[PDB]
């Protein structure tokens, strides 16, 4: 019910050591540096439907103040994809879910792409491991 | 640390049917399907909380806010605490609130827009 992917994202984040939860658009929350952040969740069936076709091979990259990376990626890091700024919808973290069959050949095992502010990248990396 | 009272407020809100939690405005509450920060203040006497004249007037509406025990102009000290946040929860010793009907010791200062959603979550 769309909530399926929000719950999947919350479980993947809790598995990586984050304090994350769901709240009924349907929104997700995450604790970074001791602060709560809204996470917008978008699911698309193909990389073309998510405007990620050219992006997949370029991850992780920093563009327009945002770091764009696969959820499952700690590797060291321009305009941003078409509907992504529109999908952020006032929030500062965006989580895009594609079928794993499309992301896995580029190293995205879970299917998730995270669009995080570059100011939050330090706190994000220091929550894991 | 005053986390003791934030936990007490979260339990009282969950008991009344609300989805409330403390952040690891440290308190959050779900109203109409939206998350709201709740500012928590604990004071030892009604004078320290600017509630002396208020206790007998609850529940009242004042300056766009519905002031009531958890179960006209607002004090300028409450207008500073409620600024930033939207909901303010003031905790006094129950010995002061109980003769006025406040068994728990908590006073909630909620916006008028949120009163509909608050009443429909009980």
Author numbering:
A (entry chain B): 5 to 28, 38 to 90, 98, 100 to 150
B (entry chain A): 5 to 28, 39 to 85, 98, 100 to 149
Question: How is this structure described in the published paper?
Answer:
The production of selenium-derivatized Hjc_15-6 using 0.5 l defined (mAT) medium supplemented with SeMet resulted in a total of approximately 0.8 mg protein after nickel-affinity purification. Eight Se atoms were found in the asymmetric unit with an occupancy of >25%, and two Hjc_15-6 molecules. After solvent flattening the mean figure of merit (FOM) was 0.59, and after automatic model building R work and R free were 0.33 and 0.34, respectively. Hj-resolving enzymes have so far been reported to function as dimers; however, both the DLS and PISA results in this study suggest that Hjc_15-6 may occur as a dimer of homodimers. Based on the observations above, we may conclude that Hjc_15-6 has a typical archaeal endonuclease fold and a dimer organization that resembles those of other archaeal Hj-resolving enzymes.
